[PDB]
Design a protein around this ligand. Structure first.
Ligand SMILES: O=C(O)Cc1cc(=O)oc2c(O)c(O)ccc12
Ligand SMILES: [Mn+2]
Ligand SMILES: [Mn+2]
Length: 133
């Protein structure tokens, strides 16, 4: 079915490093990205969870990118959902992400381990984590 993930990075395409952070007690969160072209975004979230913020971040990257995009996440949870290539989810947010994925021409989704010195990943982590932490 209909959408396909690239097997290797798209050379020359904007690369979005995404992350989210949420506070357990307070349920406040942030989602965001930084790109290799100097683009950045951080949005505040309420009544959220870590996994929801990580999915929110990918949705933003998808909304704000062109038809070809590389996305680098540290979330295995999100990776799983997207690599599974579902038709429909019970989650509205996942369905929105799916809708956006179909509208892309090429999407590469990479995973990196959190807090292991990957440049872009550390950058966005610091962004979304500030004030939440
Ligand atoms: O790697 C970990 O310890 C858990 C973890 C998973 C994830 O998806 O995102 C994370 C993150 O953004 C952090 O700042 C710290 C830990 C995680
Ligand atoms: Mn993360
Ligand atoms: Mn982080």
């Amino acid at each position: 079915l209909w959408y396909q993930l690239e097997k290797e990075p798209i050379v020359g395409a904007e690369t979005f490093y995404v992350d989210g952070a949420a506070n357990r007690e307070t349920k406040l969160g942030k989602a965001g990205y930084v790109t290799n072209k100097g683009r950045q975004k951080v949005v505040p979230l309420t009544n959220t969870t870590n996994q929801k913020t990580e999915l929110q971040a990918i949705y933003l990257a998808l909304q704000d990118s062109g038809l070809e995009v590389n996305i680098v996440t540290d979330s295995q949870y999100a990776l799983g959902i997207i690599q599974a290539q579902p038709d429909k989810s019970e989650s509205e947010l996942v369905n929105q992400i799916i809708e956006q994925l179909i509208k892309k021409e090429k999407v590469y989704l990479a995973w990196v381990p959190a807090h292991k010195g990957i440049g872009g990943n550390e950058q966005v982590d610091k962004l979304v984590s500030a004030g939440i932490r």
